[PDB]
Amino acid sequence: PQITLWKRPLVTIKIGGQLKEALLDTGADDTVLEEMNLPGRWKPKMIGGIGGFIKVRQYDQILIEICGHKAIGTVLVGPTPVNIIGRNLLTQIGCTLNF
Amino acid sequence: PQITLWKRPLVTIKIGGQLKEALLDTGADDTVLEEMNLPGRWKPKMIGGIGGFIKVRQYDQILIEICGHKAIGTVLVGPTPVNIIGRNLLTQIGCTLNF
Numbered sequence: 001p002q003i004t005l006w007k008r009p010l011v012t013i014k015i016g017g018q019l020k021e022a023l024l025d026t027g028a029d030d031t032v033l034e035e036m037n038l039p040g041r042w043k044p045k046m047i048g049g050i051g052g053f054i055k056v057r058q059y060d061q062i063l064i065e066i067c068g069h070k071a072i073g074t075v076l077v078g079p080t081p082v083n084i085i086g087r088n089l090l091t092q093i094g095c096t097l098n099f
Numbered sequence: 100p101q102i103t104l105w106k107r108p109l110v111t112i113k114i115g116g117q118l119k120e121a122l123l124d125t126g127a128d129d130t131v132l133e134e135m136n137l138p139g140r141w142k143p144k145m146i147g148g149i150g151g152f153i154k155v156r157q158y159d160q161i162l163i164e165i166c167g168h169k170a171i172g173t174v175l176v177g178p179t180p181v182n183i184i185g186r187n188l189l190t191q192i193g194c195t196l197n198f
């Protein structure tokens with residue numbers, strides 16, 4: 001679809017068998033999701049933005065459905081204030097910015 | 100234009116008469132620029148990101164040209180990791196997300 005930016009670009013996603021709301025975020029290189037107990041191995045990582053860094057768990061090859069579009073890639077899990085869909089998955093659903 | 104997301108969506112902006120590089124960021128409500136000298140009155144403000152809150156200088160009704168599209172709105176200056184164009188100005192230049 002076409003999403004305008006008058007309001008925060010929040011969409012429904014499906015991950016690990018669960019439905020969540022998440023932000024379509026062109027400023028995020030990576031996808032960062034709220035604390036969740038996902039199965040499988042993971043690696044520690046730190047990611048930074050305004051205000052400094054947070055500690056996250058990096059899971060690879062995770063399937064996410066974003067408004068009915070499927071994507072597979074790295075997902076970071078940690079104490080983020082909002083679920084963020086970053087460029088690593090936005091490219092997979094063919095998301096572009098248009099002005 | 101149509102901007103894909105395999106690379107960071109960096110664009111040239113003009114503000115206070117000077118050219119800078121900035122990231123088009125749909126997950127930012129507000130536009131935040133690194134420390135710079137800007138003419139005009141400003142007020143102290145606080146803004147929160149993934150890592151917590153920072154102190155910024157809020158400049159109101161500032162002229163900013165984003166890839167040759169004019170916007171006039173609020174610009175926050177402070178210790179952001181990178182210059183970010185947020186929805187407050189993305190909406191003025193007519194930006195949407197499409198997939």
Ligand SMILES: CCOP(=O)(COc1ccc(C[C@H](NC(=O)O[C@H]2CO[C@H]3OCC[C@H]32)[C@H](O)CN(CC(C)C)S(=O)(=O)c2ccc3c(c2)OCO3)cc1)OCC
Pocket residue numbers: 025027028029030031032047048049050051081082084086122124125126127128129130131146147148149150151152180181183185
């Ligand atoms: C419940 C609300 O809590 P909150 O208010 C804060 O919530 C938040 C809302 C949105 C976001 C998304 C973030 N936007 C932002 O910082 O926007 C601010 C300017 O406009 C305002 O509007 C929103 C916040 C204000 C950017 O889009 C993306 N970021 C990178 C940018 C270059 C900075 S990233 O998230 O740092 C990040 C993500 C994935 C990565 C990574 C870094 O590195 C590699 O992978 C963060 C927090 O306070 C809590 C203390």
